Structure formats: C-alpha cells, structure tokens
Amino acid sequence: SFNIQSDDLLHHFEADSNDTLLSAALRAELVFPYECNSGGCGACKIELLEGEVSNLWPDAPGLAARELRKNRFLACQCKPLSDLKIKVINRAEGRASHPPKRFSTRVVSKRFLSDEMFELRLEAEQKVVFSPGQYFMVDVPELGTRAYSAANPVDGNTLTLIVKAVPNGKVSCALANETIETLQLDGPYGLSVLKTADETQSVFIAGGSGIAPMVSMVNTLIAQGYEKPITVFYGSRLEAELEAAETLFGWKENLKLINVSSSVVGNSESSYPTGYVHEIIPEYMEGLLGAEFYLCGPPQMINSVQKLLMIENKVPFEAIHFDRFF
Template identity: 35%
Template sequence: MTHRITIEGGGVFDVSAEESTLLRGALRAGVGFPYDCSVGGCGSCRFELISGEMETLWTTAPGLSERDRRRGKRLACQSRPLGDCTIKLRPDDEYRPPIPPRRVSAILRERRAVTADMAEFVFRTDRPADFVAGQYALLQPPGAAGMRAYSMSNLPNAEGEWRFVIRRVPGGRGSNAMFDNVQVGDAVTLDGPYGHAHFRADVPRDVVCIAGGSGIGPIVSVARAAAQDSGPRRLFVFEGARTRADLCFPVLADDARDKVTAYMPVLSAEAEASDWDGARGFVHEEVERAVGEQVESCEFYFAGPPPMIEALQKLLIVQWGVPIARIHFDRFF
C-alpha cells in the first residue's frame, strides 16, 4: 500500500505506507527534497501540509521555532503520511540523492577504540555499501528512541562494509546505546546513504578537508576518495582536537597519509607544559593562516561541532567570498 503525495504546483510521488517519514520516502522516490540532518535538528526540510493527514513524530523538534509552528510549518523528517496528502515546498534538484537510500540490516563485526571517548564501528550488510564519500547513514540504536545520523569513514565497497566513527556523548542516549547495547554479532537497522556534502570527483580543484571532534568520520572518507584520484589536485587536511590524545586522522587514515599534501593538526586544550610544538587554538584560525592566497584553487569540505561550522562559514563566505557551490558540509545539531 502506498500514499500519493502531491506537491502543490506540480509533481507527485508515492510513499510506502510502511515508510518511517515523509523525507525518507521522498528521497527514496528520487525527489529533490531540501534537507540536511534528517533527524529534526536543522530545520532544512520544512514544508506546509495543504491537505491530508500526517503524524508528527517529535512535537518539540528543535528544527522548528515557535513561529514556524504557529505558521503551520512541519519537518519532513518528523512527519509520517497517514494517507494521500498535498504539500507545499520548493523542490531543488541539488538535493536529488545521487544514490537512493535503502533500509537494510547491518551486523556489527568489529569495534575498535580510536580515542578515550570515540570508537570506529564496523558493520556488514548483505548488499554492497553503496554511497559517495562524505555521506552519512541513519542507525537505529537499540534502547533509544529515533534514529541517529553517523557519517561513513570508509569508501564505498562491494563487500558491504560500513564504518562509522562514534563519540560517546555524556548523557547522549543514542551514542551510549551504541556503545553499551550493541555487541559484535548484533544487528541494527541501517538506512542510507544521505547527505550532500559528498566528494565531487569531477571538480579538479585542490581539496581542503577540515574536521573537528567526531566530524573526523566524513573527512577521512573524503580524504580517502581524493587520495585515490590520479589527477594533479593537492589534498590538505586540518584536524581540530582538544589534546594530542584526541587526534584521529593518523589512526583512521594511515592508508591515505602518503597522498596528503599537508596534514595540519590544531589543539585547543593541550597542556602548556607538554612538548607539543604544533599549532594551538582553533582549527579555523589555522585554515585562515595556511590557506590564504590559495583559496581560489580550493574546494572545501568540513564537519564538526556547530561553533566550528559557523566560524568556517564566516571565514569562507563573508571574509573570503568563496562561492557556496565550493563549500560542502551537512548541518547537524
């Protein structure tokens, strides 16, 4: 059974009655539905319900302001059609999924510590791991309500291997469920791929990758993809962390290190008495210092905490005037 969704002003698509959300059903149907995080935080998938009935899954999702709610706005990632509906939104071909997402069962094969609070989870599916470097998938942690978005740290492969770098967040129900409730041999639901901050292999510019904290996952994936490229582009990797013990790129991307033109780690809370002689401060400050006049030749990919994302947007867009088309990141919360 399916529900027919009509976009006011043109366009129709069908969503399975068993689909979890309007957004996922739309993307599976190849619709260019604007979105970023897929889990209720960013607000990018706002739409209006003109007719029909939809269930709201998370009534207090932070992606909607009180003004949005008063105006009748909804989030597609938190809405589930209960029948045929008509909606109002402006589709954008930029958001058409390069690979339609699928929902599959994934078995945990390995978990290895990367830092004191982060680990790389290795899952296997019975289908090829089909995605573009830099994308993410949604995982359903057992014992936690709702799905969580985690970016792949590896490259697409025929063996069905999906790798995710997950940080245990104090008080975080999803991350703690992944660490405490998922053991090797256990299966979880994996839905993906999602995200449009993926590697553009057809763009010949130099690649600048910037990671902060657990944002290292998609940056490792993009760096690996760029390292595989046989063209003349250069690859620069910036990693921001609190201390030397929190740096992840050397551990996760050893196979790509010889193709990296420059790896620049930046520490914000390393003890003053340590023998660290590298950069200190915030990673966007090192990007500003190191990239400088080379900005015109660069394509930028970054992932990390919201303050880092905001600082980089200000640097790249406001200060340097980098076109939006050359800046790639997915907004989370």
C-alpha cells in the same frame, strides 16, 4: 500506503506508515530539499494543505514555534496518517546518486580510537553503496535513531563508522558501551558529497566526530589517484583524537594533515598548533585560492569557518560544502 501530492513535485508518491515523508519521497525517486534528516536544519520544511500527519518530534529545533502554528512540519520528522496534499517550502539543491534503503548489518568490530571516539565496522548482506560524504541512519531499539557518516571509501558489503560518545547522549553512548551484534540501517542519505572538477585543490575542515566523512572522502581521493593538493584541518580539545586522526587517513605525498589542539595541557608528546581551526586557517588562505572546501561536524566550528571563508575572504557559496551534525 498513503498517497502524497504536491504541486511542487514532479509526481505524486506513496508513503508507507513507517516512513517519514522525506524518506518516502527519496525512495520514490524524487528530488526533495533536505540536509540533515535529523530535525535540525529546516531544509525539508513543508506546509500541510490537506490530510493528517503525525509529528515525530514536536520540539525539533529546525522549525520555529510560529511555523508549527502555521501548519508547517519537517518532512524528515513527519509521518502521514492519511492521503496528503503538501507544499514544499524550499527549492531542492541537489539529488543523491544512490537512494536510501533499509537493510540489516552485523557489527564485526569495535575499536576505541580515544576515550570518547571509536570505530565500528559493519557488514551488510549486499553491497553498501553511497557517495563519500553521505550518512546512514542507525537505529538502537528503545533509545533512538541517529545519522552516522560513512568513514570508508565504497567497498563491497562493508561500512565503517567513527562515532564520538556524546556526554549523556542516548545512542552514541549505547554504541560505545554496549555489545550489539546487529544494527538496522537506512541509507545512504545526504547531499554534501565529494566532488572533483576544476578546483585547484581540496580542503577538508572538521572537529571531533566530523572526521568521519572526511576519512571517506580523503581516502577515496587517495585511492582514485587524486594529484592536486589535499589539506585537512582537524581540531579537537582532546589530543588523543588528534593522534587518532594521524592513523585514520591514508597516506599520499599530496596530503597534509594539520591537527590543531585546543587542549588545556600538552599531551601526546607531539606539539600541535594551539587554538581553533578558524584561527589557524588564515595563514594558509593565500595558498588555498580556488580550493573546494568541505566543512564537517560541530556548529561552533562550521559557523566560525563559514564567516572566515565567505565574509573575511571571498570564497563563493558554490565552493563550500556544509555537513552540519547539529
């Protein structure tokens, strides 16, 4: 156990040799800036002042090469080799209600939603807790560990994942194609979560695997009797996934699913608006004044929709929740 000190933190904390600095801080009940826990966003960046560390992923894109030369690391990609003194670069913007914990699961079902998208249902030996919008780190031995979002409302010892098999992707393709009886998880993690307050309505915008946290959040709203409008914009190049989306969300009168197809040929025998979600949203924007927006999944879409909302319209930063998968 190594002692980790920082003037930027409320108190020092211990880190086990097997934890990253970010994981250890969160288990120590500290607020710590992060978003993705996956080396892409850069939010968890630290400067190493005293001590030695192991860099889990030198080529992590969340850090510029110049920053590495200036003794910076990503806390989510950094393990201590000694007691440390660190500087936390960014201001922390939120704290999760449930802290991350390691636990085992049994895979109780696998179901293909389309050629590339499938649903896993997992069972733990104790209740699986999270805030809808959060994710769990799923390890596949000898291949890697990746974040996957809860796709269910919180419910006993269960967890649902919705995974897209990424071409040449190590972990997602293994989850798709292998028969795996047990999975070791660590979570929940994540700060982009369902919130209900003074918003006029809720708007959920995703593409591909980004559907997963949307299903948890929307189905939670349905279960909890949310009465304000819920609008889901969902895009894919594969119309089989748009069709799958129709079955994934629960039903309620105030829920509208707007599937948008960028597919080359017309499939499914159900015509959708064509193009990309950032092309379709503008004709709804007048009616979405005051919404809470949740943006989930792929970079091209989150980038395009972010510009649409904050530049072309006047949606404040505070009304938008970013869940970037990188």
